Amino acid sequence: ANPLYQKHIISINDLSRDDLNLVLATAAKLKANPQPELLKHKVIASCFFEASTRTRLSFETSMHRLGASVVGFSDSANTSLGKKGETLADTISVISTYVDAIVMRHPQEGAARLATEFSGNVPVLNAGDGSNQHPTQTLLDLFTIQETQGRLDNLHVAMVGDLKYGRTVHSLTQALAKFDGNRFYFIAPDALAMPQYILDMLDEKGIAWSLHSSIEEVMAEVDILYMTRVQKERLDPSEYANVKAQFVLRASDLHNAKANMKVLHPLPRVDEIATDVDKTPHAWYFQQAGNGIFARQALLALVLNRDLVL
Amino acid sequence: ANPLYQKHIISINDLSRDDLNLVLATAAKLKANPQPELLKHKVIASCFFEASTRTRLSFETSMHRLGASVVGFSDSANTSLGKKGETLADTISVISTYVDAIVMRHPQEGAARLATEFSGNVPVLNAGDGSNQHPTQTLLDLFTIQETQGRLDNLHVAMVGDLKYGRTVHSLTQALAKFDGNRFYFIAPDALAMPQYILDMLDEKGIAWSLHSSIEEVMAEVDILYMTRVQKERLDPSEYANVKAQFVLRASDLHNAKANMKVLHPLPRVDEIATDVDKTPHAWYFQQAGNGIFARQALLALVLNRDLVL
Amino acid sequence: ANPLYQKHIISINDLSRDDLNLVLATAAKLKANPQPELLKHKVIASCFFEASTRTRLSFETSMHRLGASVVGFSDSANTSLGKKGETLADTISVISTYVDAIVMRHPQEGAARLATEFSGNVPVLNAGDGSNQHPTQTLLDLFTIQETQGRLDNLHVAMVGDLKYGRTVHSLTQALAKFDGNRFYFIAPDALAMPQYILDMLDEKGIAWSLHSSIEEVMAEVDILYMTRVQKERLDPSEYANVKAQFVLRASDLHNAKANMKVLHPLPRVDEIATDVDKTPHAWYFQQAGNGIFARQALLALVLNRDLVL
Amino acid sequence: VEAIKRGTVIDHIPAQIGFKLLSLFKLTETDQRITIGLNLPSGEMGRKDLIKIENTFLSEDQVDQLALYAPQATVNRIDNYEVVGKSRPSLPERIDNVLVCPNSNCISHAEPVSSSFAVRKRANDIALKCKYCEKEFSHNVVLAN
Amino acid sequence: VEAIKRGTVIDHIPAQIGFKLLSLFKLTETDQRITIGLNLPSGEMGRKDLIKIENTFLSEDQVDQLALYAPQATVNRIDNYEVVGKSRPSLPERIDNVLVCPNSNCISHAEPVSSSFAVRKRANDIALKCKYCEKEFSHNVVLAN
Numbered sequence A, B, C: 001a002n003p004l005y006q007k008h009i010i011s012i013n014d015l016s017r018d019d020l021n022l023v024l025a026t027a028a029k030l031k032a033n034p035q036p037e038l039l040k041h042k043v044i045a046s047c048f049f050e051a052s053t054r055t056r057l058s059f060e061t062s063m064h065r066l067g068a069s070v071v072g073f074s075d076s077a078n079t080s081l082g083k084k085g086e087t088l089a090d091t092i093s094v095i096s097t098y099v100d101a102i103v104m105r106h107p108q109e110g111a112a113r114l115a116t117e118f119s120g121n122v123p124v125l126n127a128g129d130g131s132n133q134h135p136t137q138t139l140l141d142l143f144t145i146q147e148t149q150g151r152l153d154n155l156h157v158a159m160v161g162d163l164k165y166g167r168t169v170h171s172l173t174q175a176l177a178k179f180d181g182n183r184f185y186f187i188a189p190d191a192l193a194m195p196q197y198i199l200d201m202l203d204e205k206g207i208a209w210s211l212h213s214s215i216e217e218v219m220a221e222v223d224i225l226y227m228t229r230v231q232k233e234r235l236d237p238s239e240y241a242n243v244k245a246q247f248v249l250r251a252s253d254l255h256n257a258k259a260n261m262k263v264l265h266p267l268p269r270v271d272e273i274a275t276d277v278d279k280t281p282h283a284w285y286f287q288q289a290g291n292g293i294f295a296r297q298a299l300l301a302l303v304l305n306r307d308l309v310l
Numbered sequence D, E: 001v002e003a004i005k006r007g008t009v010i011d012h013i014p015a016q017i018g019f020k021l022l023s024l025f026k027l028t029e030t031d032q033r034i035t036i037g038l039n040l041p042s043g044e045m046g047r048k049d050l051i052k053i054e055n056t057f058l059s060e061d062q063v064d065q066l067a068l069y070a071p072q073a074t075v076n077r078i079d080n081y082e083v084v085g086k087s088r089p090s091l092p093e094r095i096d097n098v099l100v101c102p103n104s105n106c107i108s109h110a111e112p113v114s115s116s117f118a119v120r121k122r123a124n125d126i127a128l129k130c131k132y133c134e135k136e137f138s139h140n141v142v143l144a145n
């Protein structure tokens, strides 16, 4: 079987560079030659316990493009966990008797990992667990960086905004750190800085990173400008001074951008990216979102189908 | 390609008589000879930002009867628009990278039109936008009027209740005005009268219309009695005297009804149609609702499938 | 008549050193020799639009001790301003046809000043207006300092806590600046610093003040340690990191205090003064509160009587 | 004083309209020299307003937007001190950007789109139909930004 | 053309301020002849705006407000075609009604009173202290509300 067959996909920290490249290679193949019946006779649970537009709808669309069926919920309020007091453990224990895989997003860190301890032989795919990990975001991000830059090595990557609570940047930094020669610029409010366990990991691998207080400092050298939303729903009340976006990218800020540079954003955006950016050649956040289909199809295929696709 | 292939379906004001007849002709064909795989490999978004029973469930049932898959939501509360502050524009910008068409209902007038400005090559079908338009209601209504009356020309049509906020009657009046010799009776509270832009349009085409203060005035001549619900969720507080239905149709009111006459109602009804009407031969609101399947199948087929069905 | 007869008491900025001394001398005399009939036949309004314990109760007790009657309200929810949409202007316009003086506290800066514009010949006494002024607190504070220190000049005075929103310290600093040779130590979070307009005033009068990051820094030299509560009901959400007391005075912190030093606090305290301070000889906040009676009686007597002989 | 070498002269503006034109079309948001005369004697009109803008030109569409406020105005295009073109505004098909839809429930108030209204003659008034909500209003009650 | 016999010429207005004064003082709400120059050359200040109004003089309030909006402007009064009075507008001690206190918790926002600010000339900017809340601000913060 392929190395990802029947594997839980919980944290980028658990995956290797080879695993990441495998997903991307599979994504390329399915995009060139769709296999609309590859997951025929699979039923997959889509269990979202906090809000989502892109992640849930792209995952379900991917399941349908591969011929699988979908059950689940987008709100926990009308599950028995919502109204009758059921634990998450018991919820997973029953759902795992029904379906071939479970895709879940949850407001508490660790929820996906917990699910694996109750799902038996059923794979859990983490669609986001509190401010911890977001591995399928990272897969589409890498696909998008590869598409636009031609490589995942030796890149200048700026990450901007709420790095403390951004599960997106925890996962993406851990992922890009598995490739060679990448350099990171972190542009965050002091209260929302990249967590030490990420920084320690970079130092371990001998990867260059530095803090900056403005986008303009780094604009001339970045290949990828990764903007993020302030995770207001994760903030402690003591952190409320940072609700508003501290860095706002506008079209005029892009004068000295490299021609190859792309502006990415896992979305949704509030005001951190002005709408005048949308029409510039550097804007790629919507193309990025569309790549979620190819990345999420690839992952489903690899986890649920024994043979490598070609 | 057929004239409606890949077209947005936003307002009856944008469609011609030929467009309307095309949908109806296609509805007849699919009803006589179902094509359960016509939209196989399509994935369609069903995005309802306000309440619905008939419109959403009939649309989704139609997608399934044609072999398409469905993703979406029936509530905006757990989308990223609901919880993370995302604009509708950005919501459409991402969903349009996933699906082959978007069906949407929204509490603000103009929402479907706005969606078309962000959906790229993806068709938007307006399932209702505030008190503005409801074009697929009109398609099933016309199918139902045609079925029961044998024509769409030279009919006596009464519309009763909340005409100001009824998106149903805005669309249906504009549609019937594209056929010849129809005559309208408007029975509404003064505060909830048919809007001037509808009346001006009638005057332009030289179509006879008149206001009446009772159903009984017109009962002897109407072929179609179109009853409506007071759109209480659209009312300004200053209009609250009109919450209760001002006209209540009961079985006894139908003594002098023409034998061919049908009572229609886009539903839901509150008290404007007493339950004793349900058993009379004039009641056709449930048959009407069932025709939503044929009209909505036809529209999906025409928009998403290049060739004319036969 | 006496200089304060029939005067509004809105801001310490409108009072002279002589005015303040007059109130303190009068308070000393009333404390020594009560005048239970001084305000006989006066009816006074006590109008509190935000919460109070000390200020309202000591004010009303003071009126009763001088023989006056009291009418008013301790919240505005059942006034016509609270239920019928009435403006503060009109509220003052009618109440001032009833009573001989108006004592008012209000959550908006400037409310007391505004009241003077509608009260005609009826004196208004400001019991607190938003985060602006609190002149009667300053009167009892000065009285207490004078009692325990023997003087109002050449003092070393520390003010700790929320100095930005503390109407108490805005009034107190202004009053103490009208005396000679006082020295100020301001110990506050950067976000809640003593406002610049207070500092500029101190500069223009050539008064020495300095900032400090800890109490112990100045403990050995202070005659008065004035502690304050974080005014959480005034904070902007961006300032919520400051809700907890940054500086917490405990009994152990007093080891190198001057023997004569008094700990004052206008109250209520949350956690900025631990209860183990209460039993020490330096704790004087309850005695301070007790002195509200004599200062407020003095003020009422001077405003409502042409002259006093005692 | 001092006639212009090139630019645009908007002549025969009705009284009380010159200022409205300047406000609405943001005509003074420029570094180009502008000359304005208000309540000037006309003879043809009795009283008129006059706007002169240097090094600045109006397309036919831009000229047409004036039709709502000054249908009888003359727009003179100036080059090398001479009038090289005279045009009168004609009623446009649409009015975009500058107006605000009076419907409080219109999507245009909440979202990043520009306002837009179809223009038509109704009786002796002008009716504006919002592209988004499709409601229609007399131009009198459709306010500007 | 047609120098005026009697009225007012406001000179030396900073660029991008002339149009603002026309609005704030409602100067175009008259039948009196007006001429306006915007972005006129100025030896004295590079570029300037200029407003001429026949048979009309600034009210006392308008003169007071002018000292805030355009300190270095020149107010010329004219009679029988001659400049009779000339001065930079006199700064007042108070200014009422027109300004808005930037303190959002000021009582002045919710209640039927006229705004009022103590005006004191300072070194670099000018200070406005609110009569009600007693807070003081730079006129830069009070203006452009």
Ligand SMILES: Nc1ncnc2c1ncn2[C@@H]1O[C@H](COP(=O)(O)OP(=O)(O)OP(=O)(O)O)[C@@H](O)[C@H]1O
Binding pocket: D002, D003, D004, D005, D009, D011, D052, D074, D076, D078, D081, D082, D083, D086
């Ligand atoms: N070089 C210029 N600089 C400034 N203004 C000019 C210039 N040339 C023409 N104008 C102005 O343009 C307007 C029209 O000029 P034109 O020579 O066509 O007069 P006209 O024929 O009387 O105009 P109309 O007949 O349309 O009323 C006049 O108001 C005039 O002041």
Ligand SMILES: Nc1ncnc2c1ncn2[C@@H]1O[C@H](COP(=O)(O)OP(=O)(O)OP(=O)(O)O)[C@@H](O)[C@H]1O
Binding pocket: E002, E003, E004, E005, E009, E011, E052, E074, E076, E078, E081, E082, E083, E086
């Ligand atoms: N009769 C008039 N009609 C219209 N404008 C006039 C009249 N007299 C003077 N002005 C204008 O008033 C302004 C001041 O005129 P003045 O003759 O004082 O010029 P000045 O000596 O250069 O003044 P300053 O030294 O203030 O620049 C000038 O811009 C001028 O065009």
Ligand SMILES: O=C(O)C[C@H](NC(=O)CP(=O)(O)O)C(=O)O
Binding pocket: A051, A052, A053, A054, A055, A056, A128, A134, A137, A167, A168, A228, A229, A266, A267, A268, B080, B084
């Ligand atoms: O929410 C963000 O800002 C980033 C990130 N966003 C998404 O996954 C997109 P969505 O919430 O629409 O599925 C996330 O962590 O949820």
Ligand SMILES: O=C(O)C[C@H](NC(=O)CP(=O)(O)O)C(=O)O
Binding pocket: B051, B052, B053, B054, B055, B056, B128, B134, B137, B167, B168, B228, B229, B266, B267, B268
């Ligand atoms: O709601 C009405 O009364 C008429 C009309 N009704 C429907 O479309 C039926 P439903 O809301 O169940 O989809 C509408 O405009 O939504």
Ligand SMILES: O=C(O)C[C@H](NC(=O)CP(=O)(O)O)C(=O)O
Binding pocket: C051, C052, C053, C054, C055, C056, C128, C134, C137, C166, C167, C168, C228, C229, C266, C267, C268
């Ligand atoms: O509330 C404070 O912390 C200080 C001060 N406290 C008082 O006046 C005491 P009280 O609110 O009980 O009348 C105030 O400004 O209201």
Ligand SMILES: [Zn+2]
Binding pocket: B110, D101, D102, D103, D106, D107, D108, D130, D131, D132, D133, D134, D135
């Ligand atoms: Zn609109």
Ligand SMILES: [Zn+2]
Binding pocket: C110, E101, E102, E103, E106, E107, E108, E130, E131, E132, E133, E134, E135
């Ligand atoms: Zn104020």
